[PDB]
Amino acid sequence: VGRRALIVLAHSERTSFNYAMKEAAAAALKKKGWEVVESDLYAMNFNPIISRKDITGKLKDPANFQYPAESVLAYKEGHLSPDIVAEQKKLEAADLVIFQFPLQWFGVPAILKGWFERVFIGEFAYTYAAMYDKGPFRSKKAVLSITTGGSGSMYSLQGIHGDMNVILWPIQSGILHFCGFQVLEPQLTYSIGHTPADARIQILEGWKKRLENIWDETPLYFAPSSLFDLNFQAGFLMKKEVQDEEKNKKFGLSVGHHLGKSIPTDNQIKARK
Amino acid sequence: VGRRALIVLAHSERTSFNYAMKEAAAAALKKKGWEVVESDLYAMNFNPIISRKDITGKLKDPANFQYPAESVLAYKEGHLSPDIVAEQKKLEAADLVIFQFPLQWFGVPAILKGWFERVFIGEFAYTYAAMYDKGPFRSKKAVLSITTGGSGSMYSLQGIHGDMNVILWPIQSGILHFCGFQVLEPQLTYSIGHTPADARIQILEGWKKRLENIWDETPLYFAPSSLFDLNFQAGFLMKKEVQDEEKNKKFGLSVGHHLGKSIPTDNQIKARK
C-alpha cells in the first residue's frame, strides 16, 4: 500500500484553484492517514533549466558537455546539485505522486517541465534495460490533476483542439510510465474559469472523495514491454509474433501504439483495457 | 515570399549538433538572401518562468492575479516586460520561424516551453475569434528541427515510444497552428548521438539544401476551422453536415481529429493530405 504521498504543484498564486486543489488533496490524504510532502515549485524558487550547474563535481568531459552522461555520473558519484538531490529524496520516499497544474500550451508549465528534466536523471528515474513497466518507479503510482481554460467539448473527438487523449500521451507515457510509474486516471477539470462557485466547491470535494480510495484504482493501460524486442539490434520493435497477432485486432493498443488502426476510447483518460 | 527568418535555438552547448544545425540554417538562408535573426535562449539567459513580473504596469486585479487576462491587458496597453516585447518584435518581423532543439521528455526543452508561455500572449499570438488557420501568424510558416537520442525505429508505429506523430501534434497543432502558423514538415534527425561523422556532415548539408526552397513547400495538413462551429454555445464542435460526410470516410482528418478512425500516415511528418 501507500502511507506516503508527494504532491508537486506548478502555480504561482495561493489564490488559484490549483492551489485549492493542492490543499484539498493534502487534507484528504492526511485524514486518511497518509504522510504528505509537497513540492510547490514556485514557492521553492525552483530552477527549471538543466545546465552544467546541476553537477557540483568535476565533469568527465568539460570541453564537450553532455547532460545525459554527465548527470548520470554526477548521480552515481554523489555530486548533483543539492536541490535536485532533495527532490530525488522525496520521489524515493513517495508511494503516490500527484502532479497538480493548469494546462499551458497543450502541456505542463515550463517550470514543471524543467522539474522533470533536472530531476528524472538516468539511473535514478530510468535505464534503457528497465524501461516502462520495468522502470525504477514501478512500485509507485502517479496521477495528473489538470485544470484548463477551454471547455471539455473543445477536447472531444470533434472538438477543435482535438482529442485530449493525444495531448496526455506524451506526458503520461513518455515521462511517467517510462520510468515505471503506474499512471492512474487523470483528474481533469475543464474551463475552471467558467465554473459557478457551487460547482467549484463540488469539484474540490469530488477530488477529495476520490483520494480516499486512490491507491486501489486500476491504472491506465499501456502496452507491456514484453511485446517488444528490447534491444538496439532489434530497434526496440514489437515482436513479430505480436505484430501478427494484432493484425486481427480492430483497435490499436494505445494512443502511441494506435498501429494505424483505431485508438481505443479514452485510453489515456479511462482505465480498464 | 519571405525575406526574414527567425531561428530559436534551445541548447546550452555551442559544441552540440543543435548549434551546428542552427549555424547551417543561418548560413544557408543568408546565401539565398534572407534577413536572419536569432534567439539563442540559453545564450540570452532567457527567463522562461511566467509571473506577475511579466507585467510592468498596474494590474487590474493584483489580489487575484490571473495571467491570461492581465497579460493581454499589458500587451494592449503596452506594459509587457521589455524582454518579452523584444521577442514579440522578432516574430512580427519574421516570415519564417525555425525551432532548433533536442527532444527532451517527448517534448520541447523547458526553456523553449517557457518562451512560448511568455511570448505567445493573447491578442498578439492568438484570439479565440481567430483560432488556428485564421490566427495572427497565418502568413508565417514554422518549422521544427528536432534531434533525438532514440532511433527512428523506436518512434515508428511498432516502436516502444510509439508514433512520433502523436508526440508532434500537441506542439505543431496546439501551439504553432493554433496561432495561425503554417507548419512545415519537421526536420527530424534521430539518434544523432550514434551517427557517424560523415553521416552528421551530410545531415547538415541536407538541411541547408532543404532551406533553399523551404518557402515553396506545401505545409502539413490540419482540419480547417471552417469545419467547426466556432462558438461557445456550440462547444466548438465539428458542424453536423461535416460530421455526416465524414461518417463514410475511412481515415480521420489528422492526429488530433482521428475521429476514432485511422489516423492518416505521417499526418504530422509528411505533407500533402
Ligand SMILES: Cc1cc2nc3c(=O)[nH]c(=O)nc-3n(C[C@H](O)[C@H](O)[C@H](O)COP(=O)(O)OP(=O)(O)OC[C@H]3O[C@@H](n4cnc5c(N)ncnc54)[C@H](O)[C@@H]3O)c2cc1C
Ligand atoms: C501561459 C498559459 C497557457 C495556457 N494554455 C492553455 C491551453 O493550451 N489549453 C487550455 O485549455 N487552457 C490554457 N490555459 C488556461 C489555464 O489552464 C487556466 O487559466 C487555469 O487552468 C485556470 O486555473 P487556476 O487555478 O490557475 O486559476 P484561476 O483562473 O484563478 O481560477 C480558479 C477559480 O476558482 C476560484 N477559487 C480559487 N480558490 C477557490 C476555492 N478554494 N474554492 C472555490 N473556488 C476557488 C477563483 O476565484 C477562480 O475564479 C493557459 C494559461 C496560461 C497562463
Ligand SMILES: Cc1cc2nc3c(=O)[nH]c(=O)nc-3n(C[C@H](O)[C@H](O)[C@H](O)COP(=O)(O)OP(=O)(O)OC[C@H]3O[C@@H](n4cnc5c(N)ncnc54)[C@H](O)[C@@H]3O)c2cc1C
Ligand atoms: C533532459 C533530457 C531529456 C531527453 N529526453 C529525450 C527523449 O524524450 N527522447 C529522445 O529520443 N531523446 C531524449 N534526449 C536525448 C537528446 O535528444 C539527445 O541527447 C540530443 O538530441 C543529442 O544532440 P545534441 O546536438 O544536443 O548534442 P551532442 O550529443 O553533442 O551530439 C552532437 C554530435 O554531433 C557532433 N557534432 C557537433 N557539431 C558538429 C558539426 N558541425 N558537424 C558534425 N558533427 C558535429 C558532436 O561531436 C556529437 O557527437 C534527452 C536529453 C536530455 C538531456
Ligand SMILES: Cn1c(CCCO)c(CO)c2c1C(=O)C=C(N1CC1)C2=O
Ligand atoms: C489563456 N488561455 C485560455 C483561458 C482563458 C480564460 O480567461 C484558454 C481556453 O480557451 C486557452 C489559452 C491559451 O493560451 C491557449 C489555448 N490554445 C492552446 C489551446 C486555449 O485554449
Ligand SMILES: Cn1c(CCCO)c(CO)c2c1C(=O)C=C(N1CC1)C2=O
Ligand atoms: C538522454 N536520453 C537518450 C540519449 C542517449 C544517448 O546515448 C535517449 C534515447 O534513448 C533517451 C534519453 C532520456 O533522458 C529519456 C528517454 N525517454 C523519454 C523517452 C530516452 O529515450
